[PDB]
Each structure stands twice: as C-alpha cells, then as structure tokens.
Amino acid sequence: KHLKFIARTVMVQEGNVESAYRTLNRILTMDGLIEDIKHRRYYEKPCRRRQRESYERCRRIYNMEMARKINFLMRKNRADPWQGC
Amino acid sequence: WLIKEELEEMLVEKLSDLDYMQFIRLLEKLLTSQCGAAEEEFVQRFRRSVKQLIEPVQYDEQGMAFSKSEGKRKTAKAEAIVYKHGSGRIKVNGIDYQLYFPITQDREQLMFPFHFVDRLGKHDVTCTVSGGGRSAQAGAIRLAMAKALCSFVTEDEVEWMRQAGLLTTDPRVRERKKPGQEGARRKFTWKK
C-alpha cells in the first residue's frame, strides 16, 4: 500500500551495477534487514531468541570495550625509547 | 658479529639467545649512530672477520704450451692435458673421442666447455680416464678439460665457466644401501 520504487531503491551511477548492488547490500546490512530475513526463514523460539539477544549484547559489550582498550593503547606501539635498559 | 658462544667465552657468563640478540641490536644501533674511533675500536672487540684457482701453463718437448688438470665424477677419475693450439682433436686413452664415446650425449658433454668459451677447434687435448661408466667418464673428462682450459681462457671467462658450473666437482655419488630396506631410500613394501 506504499508508493513503489522509493524504499530500498538505489540508482546505479554510470552503470556500475556492481557498486550499486554493494551499496544497497551495505544499506540493508546496516539496517539489519539481511540478518532479520536470515533469522526469520525459520522460527526462532522465544527462549532461543532471548538467549541469542543476550549473547549478542554481551559480545557487543566485550568487543566495544576491547576496541576501546586497543585504541587507547595504540599510542604505546611506538618503538622502545629506552633500548639497552 | 661474534656468535653467542664467543660472547659467553668473553663474558665468562651464561647467556640466553634473547639476551644475546638484545646486545647485538644495541651494538648495531651503536655502529649506525656514526660513532667515533674509540667506539669503533671498542666494537672491534665484538666484530669477527669472516674464486677458482688456475693451473700453471707448462711447455712440452717442442716447447709448445699446455696445461694439465684432474677431475672426478661418480667413481670415474680423469686427467686432461689441454694444449694451446690444435684442431679440436681430443684423444681419450689414445682413442679419438668420436670412437671412445659413441653416445652423442657424452660427445656433447665433451663439447660443452669449449662451446661455452667459444673455442671449438682451437685446442687439442689428451685425456686419460678410468673407473665409472660412460657418462661418469664423460663428466670427469669434461671437468678436467674445463679446469685445464682455465689455464688459457681469461679470468672473466674462468668466472663465467664457474658460474655455468664447469669447474665444480659434482659431489653426487652413489648412496649406500641401508639394512632393512631395498636401497638407499626404497623401504620394503609395508606389509598389512
């Protein structure tokens, strides 16, 4: 009941359908539609869905904190100043 | 750089490879730092210092010039006398090469050095070979003739011959059969 060719529509620039399709796939992946379809193919029982959401949230927390630590310590990757000691 | 064993001997102290590597890296930094003479001589305490030989030309009874050499291949051993002038005639055991080596492969092996140095027909040769088979004898004669020819060809040609491999004694020899196996490496058929 919506106007067609407005949603999830990408105009290919200069005929590079490869780039256009990659950009569209990026858009859908960022919006999470690809994961939504993949999971919705088969029914995810509510307990399993809750467990997966909890696991994903814990993984997100851990990965974000690890990335923060990696970036924070990146500056210390410099060459050793006190070589010889 | 003195090896870890030399460094241990100098320091009368046991060391680990990591400690030695750290010390060597520090020494490398010191040397790269554009140091003075005192530092360079100090480093010399730790620094450690790390072509074909040509036979001499001789003269025959008529005084005509020649060179002599020897070589070995497999069980074959050959000694070659290469004269300074000739028509490319090679006499092995007093027999012309075309009759001593019916195999074109062995004749090519004989040809190889002269063809390499662009001297086909520019010398005569007398070679005496023993042991090994036809191919081993051909290789030994090739090596001896090349070593003798080094006495005549220029140093650039000698180095080029070495780089082509005409002056390296082929160490590849037969490998002894080991007990419990068919040959040098062929183990018996694993039974099941």
From Swiss-Prot, chain A:
Keywords: Mitochondrion, Ribonucleoprotein, Ribosomal protein
GO CC term, one of those recorded: mitochondrion
InterPro entries in the cross-refs: Ribosomal_bS21, Ribosomal_bS21_sf
Cell location: Mitochondrion
Cytoplasm in keyword set: no
PANTHER family referenced in this protein's UniProt entry, alphabetically: MITOCHONDRIAL 28S RIBOSOMAL PROTEIN S21, SMALL RIBOSOMAL SUBUNIT PROTEIN BS21M
Assembly description: Component of the mitochondrial small ribosomal subunit (mt-SSU). Mature mammalian 55S mitochondrial ribosomes consist of a small (28S) and a large (39S) subunit. The 28S small subunit contains a 12S ribosomal RNA (12S mt-rRNA) and 30 different proteins. The 39S large subunit contains a 16S rRNA (16S mt-rRNA), a copy of mitochondrial valine transfer RNA (mt-tRNA(Val)), which plays an integral structural role, and 52 different proteins.
Family under the similarity heading: Belongs to the bacterial ribosomal protein bS21 family.
Keyword Glycoprotein: no
Any one GO molecular-function label of the UniProt entry: structural constituent of ribosome
Protein known as: Small ribosomal subunit protein bS21m
Top-level taxon: Eukaryota
GO biological process: mitochondrial translation; translation
Classification of source organism: Eukaryota, Metazoa, Chordata, Craniata, Vertebrata
Organism name: Homo sapiens
Swiss-Prot record, chain B:
Residues modified to N6-acetyllysine: K84
Compartments in which it is found: Mitochondrion
Region of interest called Disordered, as start-end residue ranges on this chain: 171-192
Subunit structure, interactors included: Component of the mitochondrial small ribosomal subunit (mt-SSU). Mature mammalian 55S mitochondrial ribosomes consist of a small (28S) and a large (39S) subunit. The 28S small subunit contains a 12S ribosomal RNA (12S mt-rRNA) and 30 different proteins. The 39S large subunit contains a 16S rRNA (16S mt-rRNA), a copy of mitochondrial valine transfer RNA (mt-tRNA(Val)), which plays an integral structural role, and 52 different proteins.
Family: Belongs to the universal ribosomal protein uS9 family.
Annotated protein name in UniProt: Small ribosomal subunit protein uS9m
Full-protein residues shown: 199 to 395 of 396
